[PDB]
Symmetry: C3
């Protein structure tokens, strides 16, 4: 009898309801009443073990009963997060058991909480753990140390590869993937001992840094939905604030890819102000709240839940993050969120059946490029010679395509389907993916042979998965690229690649690559060096430019040339069938989606000026369905104000 | 006690609020110095109108191989001081590593405590017999940013303290709390060790004054319970070194830094006399955080600021230099030929002025405007928990002290005195607070008890000015802004939101096109009983509550930090003056308008009023002095200042004393 | 006696490169490297004799991987410098600097026995490198072998906490132990090799010398070496310089090693041959022009070789595909083409190139270990760049060195114990002591003797403020009063950059501290503020110029060496300016150094400015003939027109 989320569910707007001792019945009722009046249907509650434990060690559920009963009274469904006892100062929760004894305390917590709260008819989902993964993994603790020792003994690694060269085996990184898989699957199995009825959910976080911890295809085996925390103040450090549209779109695409056939939703969005908390503190504008909800729904999200409706009262984040003001009335952020909840109720059929319009462009990242980069840059936090270049590179291509109004997937390489017979009009972008193995190179050969277009820039494929450079021993991509690297020469943080005949002046970052072509067509620069090539490989094509041009775009804060070059390489079908911009627009984004056979476009202007965007491609005439600052169109030229969000319905 | 403490006092001087102030210097004594070198120092010190020296009684340089005490090195120095009629402040400094410049702050172990007992017995029993001993300094510079929680003595003391205190993880209403056990222990631990050192000295000498020099006060004030220290001291001192302690200020505002440091120590002293135990006397080569060599002009500025703030002395670190490793040939007032620098010549003019003006200089009482800028330990502790030790700025350690120092600077540039006091040092027991003003600037932690004291203060005619996140938290880091605002009654209003902005933004008021620099966070409120003040966006950003006979001005944006970030205190000056009771502006000499980089402070001696004026601007200034009564007579000026009818013409870096006739 | 030539000061210099040998490489790849190395006019390679790649499971030594490389070297007539490199973690790029334990010392004994006994039999072995890059900033005081050695050393030394006069002192036990510990381990490695091979040269490569010179006792090392080497990598070792002054850095590094070598020949064991991808502190890819500059600077400073790290690249993890002179197709980069031109020049000019003697101007810039140790105690490890940071006691003398380079004057760069203070006459000799903050009574007596016998002494900054125990005689009774004929009065801290304006009309940039003095016998020099800021003392036949403000660090901070150049030239004996070719005036970003071979004088000129320069050369005798120029330089009389990044050799004809 519990409702099960699906790809046909009506999306919801929701908020964390922060429950701690000291709150009154009257305060909590005020929150649920305003939450229901704000067109929110869902809340999330942290089921703190600390606030159910009695002196004698029995479980007292009264604090959480009070909240579940008020949610039920106001017809609000609950996402219940399993959060066992931990220090009051531990804001995010522990990520693994400390010890075998602690594992047994967690077993007991799950037994007690799931057996009790599974009986409430307004329970919508169990969140297995808050925010799996951390930059500070507990290798000091006995539980983790023992698990890592056992894992190493069950794996058979050599210090040399088949040809006899030294290798790195990345035991720690490969263990951490398996360790997350094990603990999340164990938590799922524990819940399922007591409740087989309710959805299981989890919220990976800080995905542009922690994606190397996460094996989403394995997690699909035990989840009913994938979530995510995407907080502007913690997770978007690689972007300026005016590009948090791009950051949220990439974060949504990354989760959507991880989810595969499962529905996804954004478990945490920033609902309010940073006083002392956050790395990049802000108070989201009402305009930002609208931008984030639409970007997520346009990327197939089945929900957006804000951290938080109400604030914590003591120490860390006291009076921070809240959508309500200190009088428990609506901020401009809650008023904005309420307009989106209202829009959904008035447009149920459209909003329940959203499918992202895939351009056929996939930007791929792999765990192994991140792991090899961490070994080579020895943890430096400065450019290409720092942690993060292997994620900033593909995010920069993502930004360039967003400013061209083109959708792009953002996927771990294992989430891409390499099993099809035809890849005509499909495109893969491998931007500074410095580690590729023989198995993945065979998949890319098959993809291109069957009509795929491959774009590769930066140090893509310089190393294999053992940090062995085939560029030195015998280049594994020679066959596919129809060419061979000659040299990298370090330059300044920003330099220009000036193509022969002035066809392009591409900003580039740090390293200039030169190559020698065999089967590929060489592209020369004005200094007479070969800096790029195009290989015809079976029915498909490869464009290779071994200088970092996506990081060059990032460093110059100018994506226009990267946009123009990328558009010139795209199959005609992509530009004919997908609405996009007639040219590059700085600080504008568009993404299109379909619902029940009708096409829609989402447009957001993040520039300081009114913009007239000329939309070309696909079919139909613009009908403005949503526009929070009175945008207007003349033919398919959209006039859109700073910070405005527009939804166009494409008619016949 | 009066006739009894006079029989204890014996032939030793007892410092008092009527003592003649002195100028003095550290005499640095270490092995290898010759009789002839040491005599040269005392002779020049006496000829420079200095009457006092301070000597570090190094345990290291008295300990013999067998463990007995040899006093010869210090006897030689005390005898030469006595020959030249120089009195000695003797610092208790037990044996420690040669590389430990400042000295240990607590015993390392029970065994170490017994070595310290033995040191005190030997040194006090011997040197108490010299007729030129003026004071015992119980410990050099109590307190440190790096407290030794790793060491067994401190670890055990903290364990015992926690067992004797009963803290709950929840408050009366049931909310989670922080108890700040570490910070509350550290207060009690400093109180305990200093009181124990006093008790040890008093076993062997009940005649001589006990003294101590708290240091780096804008950072370490959260370690110091001055009202408790009054129980066992005869005088409070201080180290105020331009190169270590004034990092929150540029050099051109070290006048303001020294005035604030003097006001902070004066407040801590209460009924006890105070003096500045350490002022910077010379050059930083490799030492110091903000290195300098004080100008002759800075030496004169610092001595007058301290005396105008009731100091009974100024002692310079140092007359002569250390010779080996850390600070070798640094900090000295004498040059490498053992002759006067321009700093010693300048200090000598102040010693000479005192001898020619004894009655005036012995009876200085600061002219209290009635403005008190209040800080509390708990705001500093809560800030340290919330900013997780970040070291920039409102989101960093130090905002809770920089905010009140900014108000202090704004008032200095208006020529108005202000007290700078820990909230426990403020007298909340009076029946009438008409024409008194309290400024609570970003004092983020206030408890129910202190809010009741503020309600009483305002009800009885007090004016309360509150800016920044004042009262956002209680003493357990619980925000009543979230649970039910404890200042709603007093403020007649309730916070609505904080929204983070840039480091510097403008508050643009609805009326008069009026603009205030603000830092980092914009506060909005809803008024009940208070009168709202709106901004151009139609949000309420401030209010005035009329509460009994007094008033409250509340602006929950940081406008003092806004003034600091913009490097412009003029608007904060104008706003504060507009909120002051008329009596303050009528009775106190002040500037007719704000003067950037000028300061004035007034004081009284035997019924005559005086003003101290210092110009730190790059230009000659004509300052129009208004308020109080009398005609300007220039008593002191080091660059030929002149007045025409209370308009003073004062040169860059000049220090002026006006006598009001 | 066996087949290998023994290096000497008359050896023909060579160009060479590291050949990086690891498992996985094919016979065909390795042959391609040696063939191209021989075709590039290189005669020498260096090979890291990795213990890891000779150790078998059972603990026996299998030499096959290295035999293959030695046999291909021999086939192409390439001689080998073999570096002793015992087993260590794959991630340990540089190698361990001392044994970890007594048990580890025995494994190293066994490694040396096996490797030296076997490879000593190859006729193309030229040298044993005793250890790669002795010295580290992070000495292993935590490990049992080092801990025990330091305990024993302290028990055998008897230090007092007070000096003779009774003042407290520092004794720098750690620093003094580290000198003796390097001396001991290198001498022990030499003795171990000599158990099995008395025939081949022993070599070692000190590194990062502007930071690690305080670890190195070169005069002791001469007792067990046949040659001194050095690693001088633009991406690791030249942090104190901008890239446009790596000419000055390499010349100073060469002078420092040349001084250390004394009567031994020296060569540069490691020069940067290629690109930094992820490695290096100051990453670059050397230009062809930089390769030519570095080889000529070293040869002009008496180097008997330049070996590049590396010919070919490592393949896995740290430095994979980095540092290589060949490209990823195993063909010549523009760096290898440039190096080949120098190897070809040597073969066509053997008699000249085999007999190079640097033309000593008579100027010696002196540094001492003790100034570096005292600075480390006083700055408590601060890294803020300036006088109040680690490195000022080396940056100060390097700044004087740069000022003299831009005047076209040679200068020695020597540890004070490497200077010969035993001569009877120092007429027309000059010593520069720039911010050498620690001097003891023994060295002051040597300086008194030097000046008395006709020497000129230039002292700036805090020179002589402290003695070797960090005790300031400036405070207790100034030990240099007699020599300087004057006494310090005050130091007053100022801004990072201020001006010293003489009453008569030098305006010298100065850094951080202004010193004032009182003269007795010396002639005072007053500034425009009426303060005495410097003096000239006539002492016996010589003179002293003392300016206790840091004017070399002032030049560095202002990026302007012109005033320091003009002042220094005005103080030099006439004979130096008459007998040595130099520039008629200061030239920013140009350098010249002169040398002699078999009675003929030559000059090396390099232009590092952005523009073509016409340099007027004066002093010495003869007419300029351009022997080498890589960008078509020309001379008219003795005015050389030289392009940006060009290296020129002039032969002086008369
Ligand atoms: O920091 C604000 C909130 C936290 O209070 C909470 O643990 C939540 O899960 C979360 N993830 C990232 C940020 N946040
Ligand atoms: O640093 C100069 C002097 C010290 O030598 C001495 O210990 C003195 O107590 C002090 N407090 C702050 C600075 N100083
Ligand atoms: O870093 C490049 C090379 C190293 O691979 C090698 O160990 C060599 O000894 C060396 N010294 C300094 C730099 N280098
Ligand atoms: Cl939660
Ligand atoms: Cl003292
Ligand atoms: Cl080697």
């Amino acid at each position: 009898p519990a409702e099960r989320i699906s790809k046909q569910s009506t999306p919801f707007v929701g908020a964390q309801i922060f429950i701690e001792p000291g709150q009154t019945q009257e305060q909590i009722e005020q929150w649920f009443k305003l939450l229901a009046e704000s067109n929110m249907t869902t809340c999330r509650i942290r089921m703190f073990g600390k606030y159910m434990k009695t002196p004698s060690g029995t479980y007292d559920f009264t604090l959480f009963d009070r909240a579940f009963k008020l949610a039920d009274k106001y017809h609000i469904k609950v996402y219940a997060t399993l959060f066992p006892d931990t220090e009051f100062t531990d804001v995010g929760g522990f990520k693994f058991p400390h010890s075998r004894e602690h594992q047994k305390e967690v077993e007991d917590y799950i037994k007690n909480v799931v057996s009790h709260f599974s009986q409430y008819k307004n329970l919508a989902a169990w969140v297995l753990i808050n925010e799996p993964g951390t930059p500070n993994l507990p290798f000091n603790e006995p539980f983790t140390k023992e698990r890592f020792s056992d894992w190493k003994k069950e794996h058979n690694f050599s210090e040399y590869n088949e040809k006899g060269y030294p290798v790195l085996n990345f035991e720690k990184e490969n263990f951490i993937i398996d360790y997350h898989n094990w603990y999340l699957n164990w938590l799922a199995n524990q819940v399922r001992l007591y409740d087989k009825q309710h959805d299981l959910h989890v919220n990976p976080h800080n995905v542009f840094k922690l994606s190397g911890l996460y094996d989403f295809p394995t997690w699909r085996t035990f989840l009913n939905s994938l979530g995510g925390s995407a907080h502007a103040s913690w997770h978007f450090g690689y972007f300026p604030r005016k590009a948090y549209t791009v950051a949220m779109s990439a974060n949504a695409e990354l989760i959507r890819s991880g989810a595969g056939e499962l529905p996804w939703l954004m478990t945490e969005l920033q609902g309010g102000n940073n006083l002392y908390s956050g790395a990049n503190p802000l108070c989201p504008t009402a305009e930002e709240i609208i931008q984030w909800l639409w970007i997520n729904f346009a990327t197939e999200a089945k929900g957006g839940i804000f951290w938080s409706f109400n604030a914590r009262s003591t120490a860390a984040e006291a009076g921070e993050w809240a959508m309500i003001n200190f009088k428990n009335k609506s901020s401009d952020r809650l008023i904005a969120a309420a307009t989106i909840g209202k829009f959904i109720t008035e447009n149920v059929k459209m909003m329940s059946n959203i499918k992202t319009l895939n351009s056929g462009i996939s930007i791929l990242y792999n765990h192994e490029s991140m792991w090899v980069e961490a070994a080579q840059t020895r943890g430096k936090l400065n450019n290409g010679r720092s942690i993060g270049a292997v994620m900033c590179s593909p995010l920069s291509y993502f930004e360039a395509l967003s400013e061209t109004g083109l959708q792009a997937n953002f996927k771990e390489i294992k989430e891409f389907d390499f099993s099809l017979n035809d890849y005509t009009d499909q495109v893969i972008i491998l931007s500074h993916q410095i580690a590729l193995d023989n198995k993945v190179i065979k998949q890319l050969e098959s993809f291109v042979e069957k009509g795929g277009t491959l774009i590769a820039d930066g140090l893509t494929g310089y190393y294999d998965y053992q940090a062995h450079s085939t560029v030195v021993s015998g280049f594994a991509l020679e066959n596919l690229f129809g060419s061979y690297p000659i040299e990298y020469k370090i330059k300044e943080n920003l330099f220009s690649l000036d193509f022969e005949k002035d066809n392009y002046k591409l900003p580039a970052h740090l390293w200039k690559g030169t190559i020698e072509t065999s089967k590929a067509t060489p592209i020369m620069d004005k200094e007479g060096e070969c800096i790029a090539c195009i290989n015809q490989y079976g029915k498909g094509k490869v464009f290779w430019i071994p200088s970092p041009i996506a990081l060059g775009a990032r460093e110059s804060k100018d994506f226009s040339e990267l946009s123009k070059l990328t558009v010139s390489l795209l199959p005609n079908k992509i530009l004919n069938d997908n609405p996009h911009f007639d040219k590059h627009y700085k600080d504008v984004m568009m993404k299109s989606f379909k619902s029940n056979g009708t096409m829609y476009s989402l447009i957001i202007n993040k520039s300081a000026s009114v913009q007239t965007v000329d939309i070309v491609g696909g079919k139909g005439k613009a009908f403005i369905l949503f526009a929070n600052k009175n945008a207007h169109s003349t033919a398919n030229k959209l006039t859109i104000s700073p910070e405005e969000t527009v939804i166009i319905k494409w008619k016949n």
